[PDB]
Coordinates of C-alpha atoms and ligand atoms in Angstrom, one line a residue:
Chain A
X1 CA -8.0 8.9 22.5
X2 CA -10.2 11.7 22.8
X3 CA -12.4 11.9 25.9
X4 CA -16.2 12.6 26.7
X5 CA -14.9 16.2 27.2
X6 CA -13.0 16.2 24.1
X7 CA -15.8 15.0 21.4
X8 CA -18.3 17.5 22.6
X9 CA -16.1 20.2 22.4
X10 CA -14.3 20.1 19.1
X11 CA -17.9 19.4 17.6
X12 CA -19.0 22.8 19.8
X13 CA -16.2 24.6 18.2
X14 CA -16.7 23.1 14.7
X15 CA -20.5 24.6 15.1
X16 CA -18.9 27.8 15.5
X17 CA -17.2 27.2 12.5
X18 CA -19.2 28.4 10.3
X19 CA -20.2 28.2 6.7
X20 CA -17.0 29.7 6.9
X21 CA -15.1 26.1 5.6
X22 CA -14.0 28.0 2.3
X23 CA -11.9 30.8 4.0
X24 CA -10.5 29.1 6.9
X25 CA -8.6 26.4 5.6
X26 CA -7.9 28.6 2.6
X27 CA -6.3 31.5 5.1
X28 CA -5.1 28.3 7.1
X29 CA -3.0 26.7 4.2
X30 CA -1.5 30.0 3.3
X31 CA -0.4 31.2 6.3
X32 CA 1.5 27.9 6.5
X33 CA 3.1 28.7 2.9
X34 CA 4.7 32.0 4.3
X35 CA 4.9 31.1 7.7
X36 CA 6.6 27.7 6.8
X37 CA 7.8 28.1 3.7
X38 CA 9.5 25.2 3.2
X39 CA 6.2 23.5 3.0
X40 CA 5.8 24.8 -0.6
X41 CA 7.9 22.0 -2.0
X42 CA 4.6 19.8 -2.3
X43 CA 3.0 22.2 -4.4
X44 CA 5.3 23.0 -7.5
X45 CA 2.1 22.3 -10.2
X46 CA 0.3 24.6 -7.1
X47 CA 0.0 28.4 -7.7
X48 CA 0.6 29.9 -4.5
X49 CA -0.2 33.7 -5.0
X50 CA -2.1 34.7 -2.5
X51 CA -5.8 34.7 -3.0
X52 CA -4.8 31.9 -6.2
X53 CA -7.6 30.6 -7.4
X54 CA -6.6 26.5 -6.5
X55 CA -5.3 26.9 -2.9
X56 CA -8.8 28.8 -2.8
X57 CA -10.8 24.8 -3.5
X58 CA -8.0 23.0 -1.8
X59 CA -8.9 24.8 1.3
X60 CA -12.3 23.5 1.3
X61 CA -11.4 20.2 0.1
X62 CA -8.9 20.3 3.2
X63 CA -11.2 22.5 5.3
X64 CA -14.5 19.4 4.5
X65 CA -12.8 16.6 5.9
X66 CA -11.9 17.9 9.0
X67 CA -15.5 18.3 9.2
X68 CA -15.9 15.3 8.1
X69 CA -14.4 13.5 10.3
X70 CA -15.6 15.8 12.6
X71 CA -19.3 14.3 11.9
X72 CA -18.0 10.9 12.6
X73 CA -15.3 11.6 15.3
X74 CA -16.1 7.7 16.5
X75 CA -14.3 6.4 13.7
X76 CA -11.8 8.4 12.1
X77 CA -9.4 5.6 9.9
X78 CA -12.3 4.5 7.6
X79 CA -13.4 8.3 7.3
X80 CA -9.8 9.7 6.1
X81 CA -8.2 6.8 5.7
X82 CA -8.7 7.3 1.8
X83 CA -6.6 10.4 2.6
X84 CA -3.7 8.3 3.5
X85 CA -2.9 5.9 0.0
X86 CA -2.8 9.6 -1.0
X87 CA -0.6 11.4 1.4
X88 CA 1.7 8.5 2.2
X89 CA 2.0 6.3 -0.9
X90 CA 2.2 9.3 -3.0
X91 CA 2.2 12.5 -1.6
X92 CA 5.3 11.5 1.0
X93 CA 4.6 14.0 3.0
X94 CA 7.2 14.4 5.8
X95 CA 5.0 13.5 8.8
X96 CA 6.5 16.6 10.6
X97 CA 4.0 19.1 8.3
X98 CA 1.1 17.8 9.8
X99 CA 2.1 19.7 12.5
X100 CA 2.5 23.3 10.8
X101 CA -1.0 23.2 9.3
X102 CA -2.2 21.7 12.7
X103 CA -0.6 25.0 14.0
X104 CA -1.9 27.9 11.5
X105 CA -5.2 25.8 12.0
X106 CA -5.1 26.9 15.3
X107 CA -4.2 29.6 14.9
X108 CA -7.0 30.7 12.0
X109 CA -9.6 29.6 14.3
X110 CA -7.8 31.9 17.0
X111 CA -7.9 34.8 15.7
X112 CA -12.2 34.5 14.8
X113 CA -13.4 32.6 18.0
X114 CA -10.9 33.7 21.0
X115 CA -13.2 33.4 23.6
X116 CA -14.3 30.1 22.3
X117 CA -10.7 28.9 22.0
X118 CA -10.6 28.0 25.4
X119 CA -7.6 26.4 27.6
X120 CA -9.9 22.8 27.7
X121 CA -10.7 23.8 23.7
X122 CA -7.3 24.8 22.9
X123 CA -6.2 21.2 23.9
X124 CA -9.4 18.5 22.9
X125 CA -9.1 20.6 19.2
X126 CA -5.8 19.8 19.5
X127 CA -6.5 16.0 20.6
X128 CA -8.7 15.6 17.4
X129 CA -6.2 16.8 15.0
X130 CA -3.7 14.5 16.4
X131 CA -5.3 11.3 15.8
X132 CA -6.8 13.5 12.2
X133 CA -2.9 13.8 11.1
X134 CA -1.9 10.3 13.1
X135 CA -4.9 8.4 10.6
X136 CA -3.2 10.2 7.2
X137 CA 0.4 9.0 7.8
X138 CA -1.0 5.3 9.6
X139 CA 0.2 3.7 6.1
X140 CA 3.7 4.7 7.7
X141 CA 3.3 2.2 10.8
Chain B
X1 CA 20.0 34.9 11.8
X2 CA 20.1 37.6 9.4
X3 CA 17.2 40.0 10.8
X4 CA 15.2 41.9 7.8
X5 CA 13.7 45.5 8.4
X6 CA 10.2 45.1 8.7
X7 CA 10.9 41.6 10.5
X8 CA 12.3 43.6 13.6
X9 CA 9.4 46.7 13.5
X10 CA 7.2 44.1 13.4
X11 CA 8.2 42.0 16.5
X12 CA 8.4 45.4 18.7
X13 CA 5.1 46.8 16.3
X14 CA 3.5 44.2 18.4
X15 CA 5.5 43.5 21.6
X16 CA 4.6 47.6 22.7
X17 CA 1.3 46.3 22.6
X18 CA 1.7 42.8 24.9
X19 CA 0.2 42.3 27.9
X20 CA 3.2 40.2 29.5
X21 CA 1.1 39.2 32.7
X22 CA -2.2 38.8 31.3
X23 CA -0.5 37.0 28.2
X24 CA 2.5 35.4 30.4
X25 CA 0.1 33.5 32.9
X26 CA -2.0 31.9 29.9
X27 CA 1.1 30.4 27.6
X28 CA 2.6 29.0 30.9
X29 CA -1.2 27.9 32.0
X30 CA -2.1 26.8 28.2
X31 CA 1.1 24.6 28.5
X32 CA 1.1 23.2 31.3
X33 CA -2.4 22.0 30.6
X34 CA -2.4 21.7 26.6
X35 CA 0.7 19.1 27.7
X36 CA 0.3 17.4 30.5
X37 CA 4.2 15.8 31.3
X38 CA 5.2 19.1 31.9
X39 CA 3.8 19.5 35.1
X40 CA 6.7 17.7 36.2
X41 CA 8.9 20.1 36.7
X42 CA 6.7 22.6 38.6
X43 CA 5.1 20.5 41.3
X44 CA 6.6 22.8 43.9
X45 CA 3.9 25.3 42.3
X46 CA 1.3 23.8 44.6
X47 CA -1.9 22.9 42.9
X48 CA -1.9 22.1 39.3
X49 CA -4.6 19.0 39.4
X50 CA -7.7 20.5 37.1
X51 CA -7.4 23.1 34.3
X52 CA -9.6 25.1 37.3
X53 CA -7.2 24.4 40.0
X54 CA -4.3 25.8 37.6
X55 CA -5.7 29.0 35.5
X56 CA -6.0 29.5 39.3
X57 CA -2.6 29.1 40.5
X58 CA -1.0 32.4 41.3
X59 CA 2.5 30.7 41.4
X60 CA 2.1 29.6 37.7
X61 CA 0.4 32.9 37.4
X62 CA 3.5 34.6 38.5
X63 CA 6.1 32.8 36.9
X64 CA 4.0 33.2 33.8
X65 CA 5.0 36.8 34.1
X66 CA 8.8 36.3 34.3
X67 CA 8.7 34.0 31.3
X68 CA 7.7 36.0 28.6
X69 CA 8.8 38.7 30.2
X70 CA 12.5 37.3 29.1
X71 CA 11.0 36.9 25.5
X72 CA 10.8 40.7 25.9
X73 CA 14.8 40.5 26.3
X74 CA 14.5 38.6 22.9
X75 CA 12.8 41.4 21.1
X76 CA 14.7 44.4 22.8
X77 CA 18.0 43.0 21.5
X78 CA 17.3 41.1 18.4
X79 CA 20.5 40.4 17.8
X80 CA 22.3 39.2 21.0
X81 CA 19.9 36.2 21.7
X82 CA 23.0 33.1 21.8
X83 CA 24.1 35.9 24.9
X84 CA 21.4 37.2 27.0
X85 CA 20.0 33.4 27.1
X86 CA 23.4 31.8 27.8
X87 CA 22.9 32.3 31.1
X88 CA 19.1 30.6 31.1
X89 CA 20.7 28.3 28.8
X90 CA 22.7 26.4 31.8
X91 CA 19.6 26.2 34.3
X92 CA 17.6 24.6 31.9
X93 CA 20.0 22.2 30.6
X94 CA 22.0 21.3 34.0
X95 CA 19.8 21.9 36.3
X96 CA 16.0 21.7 35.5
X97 CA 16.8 19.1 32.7
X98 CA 14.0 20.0 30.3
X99 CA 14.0 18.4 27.1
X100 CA 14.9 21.0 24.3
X101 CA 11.4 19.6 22.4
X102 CA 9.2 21.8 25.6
X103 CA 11.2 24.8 24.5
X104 CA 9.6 24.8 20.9
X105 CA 5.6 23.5 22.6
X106 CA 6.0 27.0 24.4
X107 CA 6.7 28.8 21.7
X108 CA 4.5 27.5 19.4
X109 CA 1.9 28.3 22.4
X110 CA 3.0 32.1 22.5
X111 CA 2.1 32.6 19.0
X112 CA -1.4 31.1 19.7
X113 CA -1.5 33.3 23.1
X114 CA -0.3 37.0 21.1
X115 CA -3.1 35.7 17.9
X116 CA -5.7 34.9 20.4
X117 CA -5.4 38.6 21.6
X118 CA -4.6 40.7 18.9
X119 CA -6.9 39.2 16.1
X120 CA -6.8 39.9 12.9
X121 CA -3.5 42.0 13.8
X122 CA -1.7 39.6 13.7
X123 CA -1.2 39.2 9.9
X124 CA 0.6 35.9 8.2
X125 CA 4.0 38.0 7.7
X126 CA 3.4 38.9 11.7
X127 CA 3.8 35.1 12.1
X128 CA 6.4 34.5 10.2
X129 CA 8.5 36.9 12.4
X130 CA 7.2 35.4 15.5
X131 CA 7.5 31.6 14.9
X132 CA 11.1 33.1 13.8
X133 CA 11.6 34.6 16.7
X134 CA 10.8 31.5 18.9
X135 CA 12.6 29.1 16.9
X136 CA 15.5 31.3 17.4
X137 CA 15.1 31.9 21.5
X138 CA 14.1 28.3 21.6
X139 CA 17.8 27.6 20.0
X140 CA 19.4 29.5 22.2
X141 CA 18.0 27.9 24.9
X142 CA 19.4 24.5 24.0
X143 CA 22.8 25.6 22.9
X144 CA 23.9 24.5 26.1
X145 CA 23.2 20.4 25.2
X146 CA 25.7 21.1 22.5
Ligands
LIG201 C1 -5.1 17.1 8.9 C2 -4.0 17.3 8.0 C3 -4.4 17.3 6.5 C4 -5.6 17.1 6.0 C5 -6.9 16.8 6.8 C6 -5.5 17.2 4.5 C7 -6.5 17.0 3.6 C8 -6.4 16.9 2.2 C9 -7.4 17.0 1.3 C10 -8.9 17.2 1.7 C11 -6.9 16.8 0.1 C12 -7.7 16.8 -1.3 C13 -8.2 15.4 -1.6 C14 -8.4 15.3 -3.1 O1 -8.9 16.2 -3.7 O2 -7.8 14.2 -3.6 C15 -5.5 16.7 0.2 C16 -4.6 16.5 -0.8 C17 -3.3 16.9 -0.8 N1 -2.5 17.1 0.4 FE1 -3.4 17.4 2.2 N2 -4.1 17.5 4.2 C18 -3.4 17.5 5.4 C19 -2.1 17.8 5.6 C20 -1.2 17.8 4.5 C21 0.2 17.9 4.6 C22 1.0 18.0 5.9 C23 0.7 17.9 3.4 C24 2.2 18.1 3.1 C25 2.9 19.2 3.3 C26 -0.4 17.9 2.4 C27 -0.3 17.9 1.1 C28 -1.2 17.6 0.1 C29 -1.1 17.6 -1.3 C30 0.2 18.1 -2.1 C31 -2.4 17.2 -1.9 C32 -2.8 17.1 -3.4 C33 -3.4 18.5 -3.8 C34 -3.5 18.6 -5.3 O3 -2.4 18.6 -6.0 O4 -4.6 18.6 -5.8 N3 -1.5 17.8 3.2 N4 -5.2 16.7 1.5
LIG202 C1 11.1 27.9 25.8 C2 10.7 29.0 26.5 C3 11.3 29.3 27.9 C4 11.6 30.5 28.4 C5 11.4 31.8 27.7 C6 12.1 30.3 29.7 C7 12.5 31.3 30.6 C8 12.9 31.0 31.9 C9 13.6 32.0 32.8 C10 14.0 33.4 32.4 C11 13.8 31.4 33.9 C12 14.5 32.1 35.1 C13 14.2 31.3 36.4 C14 13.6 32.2 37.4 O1 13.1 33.3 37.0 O2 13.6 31.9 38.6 C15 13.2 30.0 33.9 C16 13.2 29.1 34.9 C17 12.5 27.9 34.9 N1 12.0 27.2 33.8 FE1 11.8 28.2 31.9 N2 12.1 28.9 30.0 C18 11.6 28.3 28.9 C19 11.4 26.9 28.8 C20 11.1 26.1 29.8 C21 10.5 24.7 29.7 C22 10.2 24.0 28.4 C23 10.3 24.3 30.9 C24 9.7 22.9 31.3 C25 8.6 22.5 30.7 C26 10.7 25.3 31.9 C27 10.6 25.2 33.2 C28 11.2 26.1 34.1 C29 11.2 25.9 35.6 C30 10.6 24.8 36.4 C31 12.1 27.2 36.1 C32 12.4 27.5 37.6 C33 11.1 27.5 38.4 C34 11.5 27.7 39.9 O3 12.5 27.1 40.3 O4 10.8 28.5 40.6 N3 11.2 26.4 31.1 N4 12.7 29.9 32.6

């Protein structure tokens, strides 16, 4: 699972974050509406003008979990795992999104902290959203 | 692949500006550290044993170069891709026997490489051209399984 290396780190780059929850998963889930549009299709009751006013508290209901899991990266299930009756038993999300907003993710937090976004950071951040995506769809397994 | 106007003075609005070494010897060294399996098929590269050891690596270094240095021949003809990678298409598929899944990990690793550098440049429709453009060279380069 994640490493010694990997805890510390995604918590160092989650420090860098900052404050900034709101905007960052709220430019993070947009960028995966143009970028993969397809992804839309969950989000017909959803306005998806940029800049609408729901993707805007989505992103930092989105945006808070990965924190807070984030806070306790020791036991991830039991911290998200509410997330998953949701996504799986209802949502049906096709486990393949999880990628894309693991992707623009990365890519938001790309574009702010580059130096910080390190080879060894690029992967352990990459590590925790791995299991973070593999604990909403468990209800699949 | 119907190409759209500002789609293609986008990719080149942004490919003048790329740094094919500097950029081409991260992607290769993000990769081959991001995931680790495809160290496989470069082990004649020498030492690839600790992120230090291979950020270090002037082999990898080098081939970085060559690499997205062919995405180059993507942009400059956006509309002969199936051609000028039918070539690459047969190494890679008869030869080197990558699976076409590593094809698509580099690409999404470009995008992450040209966002890292150019900031907030890089702007959402940006994207959408350039995960457009890898998931069409990424094609190509499989076309050859088929
Ligand atoms: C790490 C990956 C993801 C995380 C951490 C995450 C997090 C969240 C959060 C925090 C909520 C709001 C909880 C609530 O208010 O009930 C939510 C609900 C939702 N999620 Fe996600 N999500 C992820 C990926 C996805 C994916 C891949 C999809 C499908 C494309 C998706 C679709 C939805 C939808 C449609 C809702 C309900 C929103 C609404 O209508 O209010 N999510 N998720
Ligand atoms: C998807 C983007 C890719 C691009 C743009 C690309 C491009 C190229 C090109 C132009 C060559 C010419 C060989 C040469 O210059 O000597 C080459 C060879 C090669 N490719 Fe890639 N390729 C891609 C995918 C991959 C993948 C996924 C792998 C395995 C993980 C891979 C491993 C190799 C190796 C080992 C060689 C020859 C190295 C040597 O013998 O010195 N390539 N590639």
């Amino acid at each position: 699972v994640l490493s010694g290396t990997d805890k510390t780190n995604v918590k160092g780059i989650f420090s860098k974050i900052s404050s900034h929850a709101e905007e960052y998963g709220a430019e993070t889930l947009e960028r995966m509406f143009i970028t993969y549009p397809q992804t839309k299709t969950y989000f017909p009751h959803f306005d998806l003008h940029h800049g609408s006013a729901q993707i805007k508290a989505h992103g930092k209901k989105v945006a808070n979990a990965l924190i807070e899991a984030v806070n306790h990266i020791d036991d991830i299930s039991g911290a998200l795992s509410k997330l998953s009756d949701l996504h799986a038993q209802k949502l049906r999300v096709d486990p393949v999104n999880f990628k894309l907003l693991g992707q623009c993710f990365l890519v938001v937090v790309a574009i702010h902290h580059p130096s910080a976004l390190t080879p060894e950071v690029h992967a352990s951040l990459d590590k925790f959203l791995c299991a973070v995506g593999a604990v909403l769809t468990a209800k699949y397994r | 692949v119907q190409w759209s106007a500002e789609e293609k003075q986008l990719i080149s609005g942004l490919w003048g500006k790329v740094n094919v070494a500097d950029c081409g010897a991260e992607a290769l060294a993000r990769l081959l550290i991001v995931y680790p399996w495809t160290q496989r098929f470069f082990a004649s590269f020498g030492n690839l044993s600790s992120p230090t050891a291979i950020l270090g690596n002037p082999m990898v270094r080098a081939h970085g170069k060559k690499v997205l240095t062919s995405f180059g021949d993507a942009v400059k003809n956006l509309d002969n891709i199936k051609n000028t990678f039918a070539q690459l298409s047969e190494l890679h598929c008869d030869k080197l026997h990558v699976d076409p899944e590593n094809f698509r990990l580099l690409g999404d690793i470009l995008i992450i490489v040209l966002a890292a550098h150019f900031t907030k440049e890089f702007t959402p429709e940006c994207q959408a051209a350039w995960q457009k453009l890898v998931r069409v060279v990424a094609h190509a380069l499989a076309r050859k399984y088929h």
